[PDB]
Design a protein around this nucleic acid. Sequence first.
RNA 1: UUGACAUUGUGAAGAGACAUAGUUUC
RNA 2: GUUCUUUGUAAAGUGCCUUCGAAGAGUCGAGUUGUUUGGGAAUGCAGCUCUAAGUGGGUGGUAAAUUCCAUCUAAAGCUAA
RNA 3: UUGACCUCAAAUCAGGUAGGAGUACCCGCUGAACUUAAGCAUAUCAAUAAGCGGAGGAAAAGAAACCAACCGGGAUUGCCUUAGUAACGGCGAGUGAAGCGGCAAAAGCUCAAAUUUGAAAUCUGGUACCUUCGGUGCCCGAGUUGUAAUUUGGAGAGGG
Lengths: 99, 51, 203, 193, 148
Amino acid sequence: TVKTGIAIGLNKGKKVTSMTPAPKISYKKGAASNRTKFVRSLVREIAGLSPYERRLIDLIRNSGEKRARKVAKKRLGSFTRAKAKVEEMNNIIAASRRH
Amino acid sequence: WRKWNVKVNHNEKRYATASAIAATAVASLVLARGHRVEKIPEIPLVVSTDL
Amino acid sequence: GAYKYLEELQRKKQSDVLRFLQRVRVWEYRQKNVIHRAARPTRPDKARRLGYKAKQGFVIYRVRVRRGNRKRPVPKGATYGKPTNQGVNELKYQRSLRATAEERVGRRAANLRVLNSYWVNQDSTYKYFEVILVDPQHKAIRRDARYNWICDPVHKHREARGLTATGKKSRGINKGHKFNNTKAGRRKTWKRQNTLSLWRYRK
Amino acid sequence: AISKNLPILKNHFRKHWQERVKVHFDQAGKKVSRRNARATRAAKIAPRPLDLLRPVVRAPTVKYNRKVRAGRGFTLAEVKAAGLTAAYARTIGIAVDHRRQNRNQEIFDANVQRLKEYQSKIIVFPRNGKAPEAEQVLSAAATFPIAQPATDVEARAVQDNGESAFRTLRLARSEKKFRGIREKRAREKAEAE
Amino acid sequence: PSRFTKTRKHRGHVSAGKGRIGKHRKHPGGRGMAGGQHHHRINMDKYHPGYFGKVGMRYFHKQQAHFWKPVLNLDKLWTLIPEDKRDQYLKSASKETAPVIDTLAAGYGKILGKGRIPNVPVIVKARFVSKLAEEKIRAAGGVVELIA
RNA sequence: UUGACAUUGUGAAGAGACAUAGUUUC
RNA sequence: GUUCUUUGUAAAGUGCCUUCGAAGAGUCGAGUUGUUUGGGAAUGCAGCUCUAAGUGGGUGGUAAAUUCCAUCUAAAGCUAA
RNA sequence: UUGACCUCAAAUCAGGUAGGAGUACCCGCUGAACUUAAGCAUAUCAAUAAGCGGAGGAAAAGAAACCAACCGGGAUUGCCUUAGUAACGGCGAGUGAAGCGGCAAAAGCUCAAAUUUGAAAUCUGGUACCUUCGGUGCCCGAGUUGUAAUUUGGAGAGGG
Ligand SMILES: [Mg+2]
Ligand SMILES: [Mg+2]
Ligand SMILES: [Mg+2]
Ligand SMILES: [Mg+2]
Ligand SMILES: [Mg+2]
Ligand SMILES: [Mg+2]
Ligand SMILES: [Mg+2]
Ligand SMILES: [Mg+2]
Ligand SMILES: [Mg+2]
Ligand SMILES: [Mg+2]
Ligand SMILES: [Mg+2]
Ligand SMILES: [Mg+2]
Ligand SMILES: [Mg+2]
Ligand SMILES: [Mg+2]
Ligand SMILES: [Mg+2]
Ligand SMILES: [Mg+2]
Ligand SMILES: [Mg+2]
Ligand SMILES: [Mg+2]
Ligand SMILES: [Mg+2]
Ligand SMILES: [Mg+2]
Ligand SMILES: [Mg+2]
Ligand SMILES: [Mg+2]
Ligand SMILES: [Mg+2]
Ligand SMILES: [Mg+2]
Ligand SMILES: [Mg+2]
Ligand SMILES: [Mg+2]
Ligand SMILES: [Mg+2]
Ligand SMILES: [Mg+2]
Ligand SMILES: [Mg+2]
Ligand SMILES: [Mg+2]
Ligand SMILES: [Mg+2]
Ligand SMILES: [Mg+2]
Ligand SMILES: [Mg+2]
Ligand SMILES: [Mg+2]
Ligand SMILES: [Mg+2]
Ligand SMILES: [Mg+2]
Ligand SMILES: [Mg+2]
Ligand SMILES: [Mg+2]
Ligand SMILES: [Mg+2]
Ligand SMILES: [Mg+2]
Ligand SMILES: [Mg+2]
Ligand SMILES: [Mg+2]
Ligand SMILES: [Mg+2]
Ligand SMILES: [Mg+2]
Ligand SMILES: [Mg+2]
Ligand SMILES: [Mg+2]
Ligand SMILES: [Mg+2]
Ligand SMILES: [Mg+2]
Ligand SMILES: [Mg+2]
């Protein structure tokens, strides 16, 4: 940061000689691991694609990422997961049938 | 939940207690107020600390 | 460990394998009685993260509760009241199915204590659950320093007082602004903010 | 029941209020007990204090950042720095706190220094169960009074480079407000082929 | 109390000074603020213009403390300095040594200028100033120091 | 009462799209 | 205060280098319906339909798309005043 | 033919546990209308009364999927304030909380997920003996569809 020093501005606040603390891992609760990468990728190949996932990949072939987003945006929670979800597919696509 | 106790101003309490004190001299009053002092040395009455 | 795999696999619930299972399993559960004890858990990984243990005194019961809304049980629909409260049919019960699951079994085996429960399967008439219970009489437990908390009398019928996970959910206890209304636990906090603090030296 | 030129009052006694009425008749009878039950702790809890060392900590919001107020516990950071593991320092009547975080040096050190003064002005007894009786100071934070940190002198030379303060307040005000619009006028500025 | 009270005086007076013709019944108007817009409207409009309706914007989850900002006028200013030390400065005041005042630390948010401080240099640290405030400070030969 | 969705799975002829290869839909 | 057995080829505490760092799913979330809340394009709760992810996830009291930033780590658990 | 294993049954099997009561206070469910509005339907009374389940000497909450937006704070409960405020409402009648600040009291933690794998290291019961809220020897059983040690995110593990 470094604050302006004044009590309104585009970086308000008292100036202090700073510290920045060692980081928490509870700040990585998301982050991957190679265990879960294996276990997850593996369980995929066993169990395969589900009902929507199938018709998702086909949508992507015969109707772009636009209809695929909007479709899955109704199936799933909403837009952002829908987004990351079609992603997953272009890869499952590219993976097998492609390169 | 009647109002039982009373909030008195902290500063009057003083002015009161003070006034109260000033009169425990004042011969006439101590007398007027009961208290057979009809014939004690001097008012205020100061006894030894040995008491 | 096998578990982590089980974990993952059960998140693919519409996976060809899993839904084969799910139909053959759900039909079996239906031919037994509604309250009926299970040999081993059917989700060893799940059961275990909810606090299960394979040593004596750890019980697993399986139970059936119907789906649906609560039909206000009024005769002929008849409400005799104002009309905001003419409500008979779109009405839905503050507690969860899982909650009514735990209760009907914990009644069934009074002596055990309900530890926790987990979803297994539903169909269109039913959700099914496995409830895990602990014999707090049974020695292996009392001496197990980790669970013997359960042996205290303040956990008598924790499932009816809504102190299981699900009840705690239903009951609305989490920290923070979305839960001001319910958190210290609704009515206690109502009655709080509904009492008249009169002091001796009235402020 | 509207009449005369009075204010409009909003007194909420329409529920069943006579039911939830807490007179503190026992204000006295709670002090006593509280006193009575503090004393028994001092007594029980050996020559130990009643409290734990708390850290300074600057208070939140605009309103209260001016001043600095006693804390919760000392942060694995301060603790370490004044040369002890927490686990121990929890048994030395210090308050630890894995939640507070260190982003302020001035405030850091203060604590770590305040941590010194403690280890200094205390004594620990041996394990052994040999009790060399010492006599208790009651309150740790009485002995170690957290104080407000002076930030200037009383007098100094006047430094008027001339710039209103006001207007540099007015201007900073602007700058923030059109920060966004300006930024589009570069994006758009670059859009020109 | 009960014995200086009037209801002691009305004893033996049939109607308790409530009236014979139109008595003292339960709730003639209605209760509280009933009929604001109707039978009790003369008393609303005048005595309470503006009562009904709506103005302004809503603010969701306002929290004052946000908008904290005690104001202190030049009007005072010198009060912020402890008494004895204060004369010390008034006589003998110029650059090199002019007294410093932490209007924040006194607990104010802004300085406004309500007229007339002595011709004495003062170094003034605040979070906010009026245009005039800070002007008539310069007028003395002090300056304003901006903080947080 | 009537429709959608969930329970609801398996074949076959016929319709419906990448627009006259069969994954999808009646 | 004492007194006896020494629990030990045990147990724990800290410093540097290295590789890692597993973290709860018919859940979170979404639609709808009913309820409730000061909570306002929706405070919690519940029923049915939908139903995730791992640089993820929740929250940030006005809906949405975009880019950031801040803050914590849910879906298991115990506990005195 | 003999032997298991899974699942399920039966005994007046060996030993245990639940019920009813009480219910001021507590954790839940369910759930009014009188009433106010000068009528009344929303609203209000009220997330009250009645009804139903479950605890304790307290219950519950509790060591953050928190508050914030600061120079940031740091489990939960309660008091003083916040405030009859932000907000809600035939925006009517009526409603109505939170963050901060002072204080009271303070206290922290546990699992799941990990290969002990050069040795299930764990455990109810039966029994014999003793220094019996327990200890040891031994047998049956439990248990690998995982009992212990280790680790719980503040970390932490493995090699050095
Ligand atoms: Mg068994
Ligand atoms: Mg009724
Ligand atoms: Mg209604
Ligand atoms: Mg069916
Ligand atoms: Mg409320
Ligand atoms: Mg009064
Ligand atoms: Mg009131
Ligand atoms: Mg204390
Ligand atoms: Mg000793
Ligand atoms: Mg009187
Ligand atoms: Mg009076
Ligand atoms: Mg008289
Ligand atoms: Mg008279
Ligand atoms: Mg008379
Ligand atoms: Mg008469
Ligand atoms: Mg009169
Ligand atoms: Mg009369
Ligand atoms: Mg008349
Ligand atoms: Mg109004
Ligand atoms: Mg003035
Ligand atoms: Mg049909
Ligand atoms: Mg978790
Ligand atoms: Mg709705
Ligand atoms: Mg209800
Ligand atoms: Mg709603
Ligand atoms: Mg958004
Ligand atoms: Mg923070
Ligand atoms: Mg546990
Ligand atoms: Mg608890
Ligand atoms: Mg206890
Ligand atoms: Mg028997
Ligand atoms: Mg009973
Ligand atoms: Mg009701
Ligand atoms: Mg009333
Ligand atoms: Mg009444
Ligand atoms: Mg009426
Ligand atoms: Mg009337
Ligand atoms: Mg009527
Ligand atoms: Mg209502
Ligand atoms: Mg009742
Ligand atoms: Mg009892
Ligand atoms: Mg007590
Ligand atoms: Mg408790
Ligand atoms: Mg934690
Ligand atoms: Mg707190
Ligand atoms: Mg009003
Ligand atoms: Mg209300
Ligand atoms: Mg405080
Ligand atoms: Mg503890």
